[PDB]
Design an enzyme around this catalytic site. Structure first.
Site, PDB file in Angstrom:
ATOM      1  N   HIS A 116     -24.366 -26.802 -11.526  1.00 20.43           N
ATOM      2  CA  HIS A 116     -23.219 -27.275 -12.294  1.00 20.43           C
ATOM      3  C   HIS A 116     -23.031 -28.959 -11.890  1.00 20.43           C
ATOM      4  O   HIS A 116     -22.708 -29.251 -10.600  1.00 20.43           O
ATOM      5  CB  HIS A 116     -21.891 -26.446 -12.232  1.00 20.43           C
ATOM      6  N   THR A 195     -15.197 -22.071 -13.603  1.00 20.57           N
ATOM      7  CA  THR A 195     -15.525 -20.612 -13.371  1.00 20.57           C
ATOM      8  C   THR A 195     -15.055 -20.074 -12.006  1.00 20.57           C
ATOM      9  O   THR A 195     -15.152 -19.014 -11.571  1.00 20.57           O
ATOM     10  CB  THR A 195     -16.976 -20.545 -13.175  1.00 20.57           C
TER      11      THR A 195
HETATM   12  C1  LIG Z   1     -16.045 -27.736  -6.466  1.00 20.64           C
HETATM   13  C2  LIG Z   1     -15.999 -26.275  -7.035  1.00 20.64           C
HETATM   14  N1  LIG Z   1     -14.577 -25.915  -7.217  1.00 20.64           N
HETATM   15  C3  LIG Z   1     -13.824 -25.231  -6.403  1.00 20.64           C
HETATM   16  O1  LIG Z   1     -12.582 -24.943  -6.573  1.00 20.64           O
HETATM   17  O2  LIG Z   1     -14.511 -24.663  -5.327  1.00 20.64           O
HETATM   18  C4  LIG Z   1     -13.320 -24.459  -4.347  1.00 20.64           C
HETATM   19  C5  LIG Z   1     -12.139 -24.809  -4.076  1.00 20.64           C
HETATM   20  C6  LIG Z   1     -11.142 -24.123  -2.971  1.00 20.64           C
HETATM   21  O3  LIG Z   1     -10.151 -23.555  -3.220  1.00 20.64           O
HETATM   22  N2  LIG Z   1      -9.277 -23.259  -2.163  1.00 20.64           N
HETATM   23  O4  LIG Z   1      -9.539 -21.960  -1.631  1.00 20.64           O
HETATM   24  O5  LIG Z   1      -8.509 -24.306  -1.647  1.00 20.64           O
HETATM   25  O6  LIG Z   1     -11.958 -26.189  -4.294  1.00 20.64           O
HETATM   26  N3  LIG Z   1     -12.577 -26.918  -3.148  1.00 20.64           N
HETATM   27  O7  LIG Z   1     -12.120 -26.676  -1.837  1.00 20.64           O
HETATM   28  O8  LIG Z   1     -13.387 -27.998  -3.422  1.00 20.64           O
HETATM   29  C7  LIG Z   1     -13.853 -26.583  -8.683  1.00 20.64           C
HETATM   30  C8  LIG Z   1     -13.416 -28.038  -8.087  1.00 20.64           C
HETATM   31  C9  LIG Z   1     -12.987 -28.898  -9.164  1.00 20.64           C
HETATM   32  C10 LIG Z   1     -11.596 -28.322 -10.138  1.00 20.64           C
HETATM   33  S1  LIG Z   1     -14.228 -29.336 -10.160  1.00 20.64           S
HETATM   34  O9  LIG Z   1     -15.273 -30.293  -9.666  1.00 20.64           O
HETATM   35  O10 LIG Z   1     -13.744 -29.886 -11.555  1.00 20.64           O
HETATM   36  C11 LIG Z   1     -14.985 -28.071 -10.491  1.00 20.64           C
HETATM   37  S2  LIG Z   1     -16.120 -27.536 -11.853  1.00 20.64           S
HETATM   38  C12 LIG Z   1     -16.576 -25.960 -11.378  1.00 20.64           C
HETATM   39  S3  LIG Z   1     -17.173 -24.870 -12.437  1.00 20.64           S
HETATM   40  N4  LIG Z   1     -17.968 -23.768 -11.591  1.00 20.64           N
HETATM   41  O11 LIG Z   1     -16.603 -24.522 -13.484  1.00 20.64           O
HETATM   42  O12 LIG Z   1     -18.710 -25.920 -12.929  1.00 20.64           O
HETATM   43  C13 LIG Z   1     -15.559 -25.549 -10.452  1.00 20.64           C
HETATM   44  C14 LIG Z   1     -14.952 -26.541  -9.734  1.00 20.64           C
HETATM   45 ZN   LIG Z   2     -19.865 -24.050 -10.978  1.00 18.03          ZN
END
Ligand SMILES: CCN(C(=O)OC[C@@H](CO[N+](=O)[O-])O[N+](=O)[O-])[C@H]1C[C@H](C)S(=O)(=O)c2sc(S(N)(=O)=O)cc21
Ligand SMILES: [Zn+2]
Ligand SMILES: [Hg+2]
Length: 256
Positions: A116, A195
């Site tokens: 992604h 997702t």
């Molecule tokens: C980087 C992946 N993401 C995500 O939340 O992973 C884990 C949480 C952790 O949550 N938490 O337990 O504190 O965020 N993080 O610590 O980078 C989000 C972060 C951000 C919301 S993002 O980069 O706009 C993104 S796109 C997608 S996806 N799979 O639909 O293409 C997913 C995500």
């Molecule tokens: Zn993803």
């Protein structure tokens, strides 16, 4: 907190994030026979030449390669999109086994992984504002099958030792994301969501039809990653995908 095991997995997420059962959830199954070719789709434009990576991060769910997005450099436009969306990061989801791991599926077929590449709508000024918007993000989805190695991925594979456990990061400058793309930009598109929690419904999905091929030993190295932080019991980072969600009335449009 949320994860991918029996007790904190995708079947549990609705409890903290009610939107899990919403009207535009991702991923979905792409029924290739039901998707309609759409002539009002402009050609897709992926401009990654001036892309500037900063760092790679294990966040306890996947690994994220993050980019400098303070200026207009790596953008997605065209296709189903109105205006300019800036690349902010990319990541993957994968399996314990080659026959599973992708989030989207193609007539029920699961790939070994899915990449992604995440972009935000520049009309909204920052990433934080865009995610609060229905057209705030565009995610470019790319399937991975196991076969020959993706040479353009190996710099990512080698740095993974540096970021084994939750919270670990490494400098990761001058990674060029164009090496991760397949030849064809043929795609399906649909309105959807994040997702992972918070599962926000802010995503235009653009899923490439042509898979990239990676080696057995490249995916094998994804699987050595840890969900846990340093000095906690060892939980291998595998099967970090959300299963296909109900289509619910939405139409999947094909560019071809
Ligand atoms: C980087 C992946 N993401 C995500 O939340 O992973 C884990 C949480 C952790 O949550 N938490 O337990 O504190 O965020 N993080 O610590 O980078 C989000 C972060 C951000 C919301 S993002 O980069 O706009 C993104 S796109 C997608 S996806 N799979 O639909 O293409 C997913 C995500
Ligand atoms: Zn993803
Ligand atoms: Hg949103």
């Amino acid at each position: 907190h949320w994860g991918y095991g029996k007790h904190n997995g995708p079947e549990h997420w609705h409890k903290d994030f009610p939107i899990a059962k919403g009207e535009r959830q991702s991923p979905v199954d792409i029924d290739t026979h039901t998707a309609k070719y759409d002539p009002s789709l402009k050609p897709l434009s992926v401009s990654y030449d001036q892309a500037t990576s900063l760092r790679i991060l294990n966040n306890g769910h996947a690994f994220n390669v993050e980019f400098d997005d303070s200026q207009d450099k790596a953008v997605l436009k065209g296709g189903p999109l109105d205006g300019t969306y800036r690349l902010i990061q990319f990541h993957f989801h994968w399996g314990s086994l080659d026959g599973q791991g992708s989030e989207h599926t193609v007539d029920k077929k699961k790939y070994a992984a899915e990449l992604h590449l995440v972009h935000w709508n520049t009309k909204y000024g920052d990433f934080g504002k865009a995610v609060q918007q229905p057209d705030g993000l565009a995610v470019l989805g790319i399937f991975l099958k196991v076969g020959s190695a993706k040479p353009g991925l190996q710099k990512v594979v080698d740095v993974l030792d540096s970021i084994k456990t939750k919270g670990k990061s490494a400098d990761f400058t001058n990674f060029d994301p164009r090496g991760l793309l397949p030849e064809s930009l043929d795609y399906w598109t649909y309105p959807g969501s994040l997702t992972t929690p918070p599962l926000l419904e802010c995503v235009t999905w653009i899923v490439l039809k042509e898979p990239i091929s990676v080696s057995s030993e490249q995916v094998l190295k994804f699987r050595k990653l840890n969900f846990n932080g340093e000095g906690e019991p060892e939980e291998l980072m595998v099967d970090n995908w959300r299963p296909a969600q109900p289509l619910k009335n939405r139409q999947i449009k094909a560019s071809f």
